[PDB]
Amino acid sequence: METLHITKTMKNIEVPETKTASFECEVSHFNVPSMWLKNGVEIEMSEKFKIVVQGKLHQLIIMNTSTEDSAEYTFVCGNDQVSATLTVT
Ligand SMILES: [Ca+2]
Ligand SMILES: [Ca+2]
Ligand SMILES: [Ca+2]
């Protein structure tokens, strides 16, 4: 029928320091866990990183960006994973 897979990939993004950035990923199925990675390290929800789901849409909101947040961000689902880069300023 249908594999559990990523249906729409993420986009590279640049924002000025201290502003908010985001990444979005769309997947095939509902109730998928939001497996977000920063340089391969699992991201935990905090005051800074917001992990948001709307049905098949998954979004990482990165608030109060600093230079250090310039990284590769990854979404994992099925046997897929997609990545994009954040450049801060
Ligand atoms: Ca600066
Ligand atoms: Ca800085
Ligand atoms: Ca997997």
Swiss-Prot record:
ZIS1 and ZIS5 regions contain multiple SPXR consensus sites for ERK- and CDK-like protein kinases as well as multiple SP motifs. ZIS1 could adopt a closed conformation which would block the TCAP-binding site. Belongs to the protein kinase superfamily. CAMK Ser/Thr protein kinase family. Key component in the assembly and functioning of vertebrate striated muscles. By providing connections at the level of individual microfilaments, it contributes to the fine balance of forces between the two halves of the sarcomere. The size and extensibility of the cross-links are the main determinants of sarcomere extensibility properties of muscle. In non-muscle cells, seems to play a role in chromosome condensation and chromosome segregation during mitosis. Might link the lamina network to chromatin or nuclear actin, or both during interphase. Residues 2-87 form the Ig-like domain. The lineage of its organism: Eukaryota, Metazoa, Chordata, Craniata, Vertebrata. Autophosphorylated. It is linked to Myopathy, myofibrillar, 9, with early respiratory failure: An autosomal dominant myopathy characterized by adulthood onset of weakness in proximal, distal, axial and respiratory muscles. Pelvic girdle weakness, foot drop and neck weakness are the main symptoms at onset, but ultimately the weakness usually involves the proximal compartment of both upper and lower limbs. Additional features include variable degrees of Achilles tendon contractures, spinal rigidity and muscle hypertrophy. Respiratory involvement often leads to requirement for non-invasive ventilation support. Cardiomyopathy, familial hypertrophic, 9: A hereditary heart disorder characterized by ventricular hypertrophy, which is usually asymmetric and often involves the interventricular septum. The symptoms include dyspnea, syncope, collapse, palpitations, and chest pain. They can be readily provoked by exercise. The disorder has inter- and intrafamilial variability ranging from benign to malignant forms with high risk of cardiac failure and sudden cardiac death. Isoforms 3, 7 and 8 are expressed in cardiac muscle. Isoform 4 is expressed in vertebrate skeletal muscle. Isoform 6 is expressed in skeletal muscle (at protein level). In some isoforms, after the PEVK repeat region there is a long PEVK duplicated region. On account of this region, it has been very difficult to sequence the whole protein. The length of this region (ranging from 183 to 2174 residues), may be a key elastic element of titin. The chain holds residues 2880 to 2967 of 34350 of the full protein. This is Titin. Interacts with MYOM1, MYOM2, tropomyosin and myosin. Interacts with actin, primarily via the PEVK domains and with MYPN. Interacts with FHL2, NEB, CRYAB, LMNA/lamin-A and LMNB/lamin-B. Interacts with TCAP/telethonin and/or ANK1 isoform Mu17/ank1.5, via the first two N-terminal immunoglobulin domains. Interacts with TRIM63 and TRIM55, through several domains including immunoglobulin domains 141 and 142. Interacts with ANKRD1, ANKRD2 and ANKRD23, via the region between immunoglobulin domains 77 and 78 and interacts with CAPN3, via immunoglobulin domain 79. It is found in: Cytoplasm; Nucleus.
